[PDB]
Motif scaffolding. Structure first.
Motif, short mmCIF file in Angstrom:
data_model
loop_
_atom_site.label_atom_id
_atom_site.label_comp_id
_atom_site.label_asym_id
_atom_site.label_seq_id
_atom_site.Cartn_x
_atom_site.Cartn_y
_atom_site.Cartn_z
N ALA A 13 0.93 -3.62 -9.92
CA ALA A 13 -0.09 -3.68 -10.96
C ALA A 13 0.51 -4.04 -12.36
O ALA A 13 0.01 -4.95 -13.03
N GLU A 32 11.19 -0.95 -16.48
CA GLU A 32 11.41 -0.59 -15.09
C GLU A 32 12.63 0.36 -14.92
O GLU A 32 13.74 0.02 -15.32
N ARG A 34 14.12 1.30 -12.06
CA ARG A 34 14.98 0.62 -11.09
C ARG A 34 15.74 -0.58 -11.67
O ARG A 34 15.25 -1.24 -12.60
N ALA A 51 -0.58 -5.06 3.90
CA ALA A 51 -1.72 -5.82 4.37
C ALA A 51 -2.44 -6.35 3.12
O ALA A 51 -3.02 -5.57 2.33
N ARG A 106 6.80 -6.21 0.76
CA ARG A 106 6.64 -5.52 -0.52
C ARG A 106 7.61 -6.11 -1.55
O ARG A 106 7.15 -6.73 -2.52
N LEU A 130 10.78 5.81 -18.22
CA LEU A 130 10.07 6.51 -19.28
C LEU A 130 10.32 7.98 -19.10
O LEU A 130 10.03 8.50 -18.03
N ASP A 306 -1.69 2.97 -8.78
CA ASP A 306 -1.29 4.25 -8.19
C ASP A 306 -1.19 5.37 -9.18
O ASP A 306 -1.54 6.50 -8.86
N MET A 319 -2.69 -1.39 -2.80
CA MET A 319 -2.18 -2.50 -3.59
C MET A 319 -3.30 -3.48 -3.95
O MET A 319 -3.32 -3.98 -5.07
N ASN A 320 -4.24 -3.73 -3.03
CA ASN A 320 -5.38 -4.61 -3.28
C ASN A 320 -6.17 -4.07 -4.47
O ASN A 320 -6.33 -4.77 -5.47
#
Ligand SMILES: Cc1cc2nc3c(=O)[nH]c(=O)nc-3n(C[C@H](O)[C@H](O)[C@H](O)COP(=O)(O)OP(=O)(O)OC[C@H]3O[C@@H](n4cnc5c(N)ncnc54)[C@H](O)[C@@H]3O)c2cc1C
Ligand SMILES: O=C(O)CCn1c(=O)oc2cc(Cl)c(Cl)cc21
Length: 455
Positions: A13, A32, A34, A51, A106, A130, A306, A319-320
Motif C-alpha cells: 500500500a 522502510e 527493512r 492471489a 510477494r 518508525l 494492513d 493486498m487487493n
C-alpha cells in the motif's frame, strides 16, 4: 508545503500511494524498517505467493505497473478440491478465462512497486524504522539497525507499516482508536512441492489447490518455476473441550508433522519433500482480525491497508483491498480542500468496505474447509445458478462480486445477504427443484436486487 507527505512502510500500500502521489508532483519520503529487498535478501515475508484479483490488478493498472507484475504471474482458473477417495474436482472461479486470479510473488510485486515509486520521484529511505510520533510538535522518530535515532519534522503522515503498525501504536497513545481484536485460532506453516514433484504427480499448474479438513486445512499456490507453495492452516493449541484434536502444539518435531500428514492429508504427504526441514525451519505464522473505530488523527496522520484493518487470509483480498485503499487515499489527498477533509472523507468511504471484507474473509474459511454439502444447501445453490443465468444483472455470486468486480465490499456483502435470504425462503419446505416455481422466485430477484452495470 501543500504537497508534502511522509509514508511509513515501503510494503504494498505504502509504495503504491508513494508512486501515485510522487508522479503528481508530491514531495514523497518513504521510510522502510527493512533493508532494500532488491539488493539485500532479508527476512521471510508473511507469505511467498499472493492471489492477485481485479481490485489489486486495477490499482496496479492505474499505476502503470500491471504488465510488469503479470510478467511472472501464474494463472489460477478455479479451485482444485482434494478429498481422499474422490477424484480432484475443479470448480472454475468464473465464466471463461477472463474471470481468473493470479499467483504472484510477494517480493517480486514489492520490488516492482519500489522501482515504480522511485521512478515517479519518491525518496525511499531503507533501514529506518518508525519508533515514535509527537503529533503535537509535528515530529517523528526513526532508528537505524545500530540504535542511533533520527528526528524528522512531518506535515502529513501515512501509516502503511502493516499489521503491527508503529503509526497505529503512536496514534493509540494520543487518541482512542477504538480497537477490537478478534484472535484467529489458526496458525500457518509454509511448505514446498518441488518442480519435479509437481510434474511427477501431474498437479494442475493453473489452479488454487485445497485439502479441506473442517477445523484445519491445506492450500497450494503455483510458482513460475512450476513449483508449489503449500500452506497449512491449523489451530495453535487443541481446546480443553477436545484435547485429542490436532494442533501445532502436538507437532513438536518435523517427524510428528510427517506422521500427521500421512494420517490426515495422505495424498499430499508424498508430494511434500523436505516436510521435516520446512516444518522446523519455517516458523508458525499468526492470524488476526483487528477493527478500529478511528483510522486518523485530524489531517495529521492516517492508517492505510494492513495498518488500519488486519484480516484473515481466507478470501485472498488483503493486498487487493490494501491497493484499492492506496488509490482512494491518493485520490482524496489530491481532490480535498485540505488534509483533514481528505483523511475524514477517505476513512468514511473505506471503513465500511474494510469491515465487510474482514467479515467475508472469516466466512470464507468455512466455505473452503468446513463446507458441509447439506441436501438443502446443494438445492439452494442449484436454484442460485438458475437465478444467475435468468438474472445476470441482478443475481451475482458473492465470490464474483468480491474477486472480479470493483463494487464496494460492503455492497457485495449486502447483495449476498439479499440473495442468500431469497434462496433460503424459496427452498424452505421443498425436496427438489421441481417443487419450486422458478418464474415466481425470478420475480422476487427483480423486486429485491436492483440491476448492475459495467458502464
Ligand atoms: C499467509 C497469508 C497469505 C495472504 N495471501 C493473500 C492473497 O492471496 N491475496 C491478498 O490480497 N492478500 C493476501 N494476504 C494479505 C496481505 O499479506 C496483506 O493484506 C498485505 O501485505 C498488506 O499490505 P500493506 O502494504 O498494508 O502492508 P505490508 O505488505 O505488510 O508492508 C508493510 C511494510 O511496513 C514495514 N514496516 C513495518 N513497521 C515499520 C516501521 N516501524 N517503520 C518502517 N517500516 C515499517 C514493513 O517492513 C513492510 O515493508 C495474505 C496474508 C497472509 C497472512
Ligand atoms: O474460495 C476460494 O476458493 C479461495 C479464496 N482465496 C482466494 O481467492 O485467494 C486466496 C488466498 C489465500 Cl492465502 C486463501 Cl487462504 C484463500 C484464498
Amino acid at each position: 508545503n501543500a504537497r508534502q507527505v511522509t509514508i511509513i512502510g515501503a510494503g504494498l500500500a505504502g509504495t503504491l500511494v508513494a508512486r501515485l502521489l510522487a508522479r503528481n508532483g508530491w514531495q514523497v519520503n518513504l521510510f522502510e524498517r527493512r533493508p532494500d529487498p532488491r539488493i539485500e535478501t532479508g527476512a521471510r515475508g508473511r507469505s511467498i505467493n499472493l492471489a492477485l484479483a481485479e481490485r489489486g490488478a486495477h490499482a496496479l493498472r492505474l499505476a502503470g505497473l500491471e504488465r510488469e507484475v503479470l510478467a511472472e504471474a501464474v494463472m489460477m482458473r478455479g479451485r482444485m478440491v482434494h478429498v481422499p477417495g474422490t477424484p480432484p474436482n475443479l470448480q472454475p472461479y468464473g465464466r471463461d478465462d477472463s474471470e481468473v486470479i493470479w499467483s504472484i510473488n510477494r517480493d517480486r510485486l514489492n520490488r516492482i512497486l519500489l522501482d515504480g515509486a522511485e521512478a515517479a520521484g519518491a525518496s525511499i529511505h531503507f533501514n529506518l524504522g518508525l519508533d515514535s510520533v509527537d503529533f503535537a510538535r509535528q515530529r517523528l522518530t526513526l532508528s537505524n539497525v545500530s540504535g542511533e535515532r533520527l528526528e524528522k519534522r512531518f506535515h502529513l503522515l501515512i501509516g502503511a507499516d502493516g499489521c503491527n503498525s508503529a503509526v497505529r501504536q503512536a496514534m493509540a497513545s494520543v487518541v482512542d482508536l477504538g480497537e477490537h481484536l478478534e484472535t484467529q485460532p489458526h496458525g500457518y506453516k509454509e511448505l514446498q512441492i518441488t518442480p519435479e514433484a509437481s510434474a511427477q504427480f501431474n498437479l494442475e499448474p493453473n489452479a488454487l489447490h485445497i485439502w479441506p479438513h473442517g477445523d484445519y486445512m491445506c492450500i497450494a499456490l503455483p510458482n513460475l518455476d512450476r513449483s508449489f507453495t503449500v500452506t497449512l492452516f491449523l489451530h495453535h493449541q487443541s481446546p480443553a473441550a477436545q484435547p485429542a484434536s490436532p494442533s501445532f502444539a502436538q507437532l513438536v518435531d518435523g517427524h510428528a508433522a510427517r506422521r500427521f500428514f500421512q494420517r490426515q492429508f495422505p495424498d499430499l504427504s508424498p508430494m511434500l519433500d523436505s516436510l521435516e526441514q520446512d516444518f522446523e525451519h519455517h516458523p508458525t505464522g499468526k492470524l488476526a482480525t483487528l477493527r478500529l473505530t478511528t483510522w486518523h488523527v485530524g489531517g495529521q496522520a492516517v492508517l492505510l491497508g494492513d495498518a488500519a484493518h488486519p484480516m484473515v487470509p481466507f478470501h485472498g483480498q488483503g493486498m487487493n483491498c490494501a491497493l484499492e485503499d492506496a488509490v482512494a487515499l491518493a485520490e482524496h489527498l489530491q481532490s480535498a480542500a485540505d488534509n483533514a477533509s481528505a483523511l475524514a472523507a477517505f476513512t468514511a468511504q473505506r471503513q465500511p468496505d474494510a469491515l465487510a471484507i474482514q467479515a467475508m474473509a472469516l466466512e470464507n474459511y468455512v466455505e473452503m474447509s468446513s463446507k458441509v454439502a447439506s441436501p438443502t444447501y446443494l438445492l439452494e445453490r442449484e436454484l442460485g445458478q438458475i437465478m444467475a443465468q435468468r438474472q445476470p444483472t441482478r443475481f451475482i455470486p458473492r465470490y464474483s462480486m468480491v474477486t472480479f468486480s470493483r463494487l464496494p465490499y460492503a455492497q457485495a456483502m449486502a447483495r449476498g445477504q439479499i440473495q442468500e435470504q431469497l434462496l433460503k425462503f424459496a427452498v424452505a419446505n421443498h425436496s427438489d427443484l421441481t417443487s419450486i416455481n422458478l418464474d415466481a422466485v425470478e420475480h422476487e430477484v427483480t423486486r429485491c436486487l436492483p440491476p448492475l452495470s459495467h458502464l
